[PDB]
């Protein structure tokens, strides 16, 4: 039946496997019934707590298949955005909403955005001499900004000791950049968060379209024409960047983005909360070895 569904890779593209952060799926283990579920009370148990059936298995199942269940699907005239997040709900499904608001609870969408803007400022602040940076100022951010999905602003503003020779806008992993042409004194960074589904676009195409949309918006306020849009997909554990690059920027942001996606504590808390609402484990401790 695995072979008839198309293989294990085709099955798991439907799921939240990539948001866990695990590398492979041969040691996946779901929590079983242990005998400690009602090991908190003795007789001090109401009729609902003795007879009523636990919600936690339905939520566990629904969270697992949630990019297929909450897929973008067909347009119905509008979409509902979950408050204090940028998660769009593509139907009225109550079991999904509870396990998503459990994951993004105590303002985790705002806290993820602040941690990464904070980490990029601490990396630029140690590279001031090599890249010829006057100063790095993280800006005063409206509290709504991290989960406003139609417009943005800059998060970090950069200023040159002399001058920067920047290439035209390209992706973070392309290798053929000229740096001849544009001269700038000022660069910015915009950090975008995203929670996608089965029908979403790729992170690369997403950052490029929002960059081209916002820099010609007449709504977003940027300190200069030149900058970088860094996008992070929270549901699939992915990132990309798009923008103008000077000599030294690309390599610096490539390595810094790799270590933030593994060591940032807010992102680490996000993956840990996703793991607990899934109730999934690893069979082995020997994978780093």
């Amino acid at each position: 039946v695995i072979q008839a569904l198309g293989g294990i890779e085709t099955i798991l593209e439907h799921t939240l496997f990539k948001g866990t952060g695990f590398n492979s799926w041969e040691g996946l283990f779901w929590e079983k019934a242990s005998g400690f579920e009602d090991s908190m009370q003795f007789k001090k148990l109401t009729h609902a707590q003795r007879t009523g059936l636990s919600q936690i298995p339905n939520r566990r199942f629904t969270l697992w298949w949630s990019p297929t269940i909450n897929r973008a699907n067909v347009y119905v005239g509008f979409l509902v955005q979950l408050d204090l997040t940028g998660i769009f709900l593509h139907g009225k499904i109550p079991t999904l909403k509870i396990s998503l608001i459990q994951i993004f609870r105590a303002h985790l969408w705002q806290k993820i955005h602040e941690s990464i803007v904070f980490d990029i400022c601490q990396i630029l602040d140690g590279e001031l001499d090599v890249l010829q940076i006057e100063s790095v100022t993280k800006e005063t951010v409206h509290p709504r900004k991290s989960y406003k999905m139609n417009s943005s602003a800059a998060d970090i503003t950069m200023e040159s000791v002399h001058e920067w020779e920047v290439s035209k806008p390209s992706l973070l992993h392309e290798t053929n950049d000229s740096f001849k042409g544009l001269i700038t004194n000022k660069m910015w960074f915009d950090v975008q968060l995203r929670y996608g589904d089965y029908d979403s676009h790729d992170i690369s195409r997403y950052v490029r379209a929002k960059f081209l949309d916002y820099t010609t918006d007449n709504v977003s306020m940027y300190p200069s024409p030149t900058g970088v849009m860094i996008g992070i997909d929270l549901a699939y554990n992915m990132y990309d960047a798009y923008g103008n690059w000077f000599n030294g920027l690309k390599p610096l942001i490539q390595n810094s983005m790799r270590t933030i996606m593994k060591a940032n504590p807010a992102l680490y808390v996000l993956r840990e909360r996703i793991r607990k609402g899934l109730q999934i484990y690893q069979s082995s401790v020997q994978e780093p070895f």
Partner: peptide
């Protein structure tokens, strides 16, 4: 039985310093 062998095994690989030192020396 389980679907994957990785469920049922405890250790994927354990370094046996006894046999590896006998083979070297």
């Amino acid at each position: 039985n389980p679907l994957f062998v990785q469920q049922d095994i405890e250790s994927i690989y354990k370094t046996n310093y006894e046999k590896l030192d006998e083979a070297v020396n």
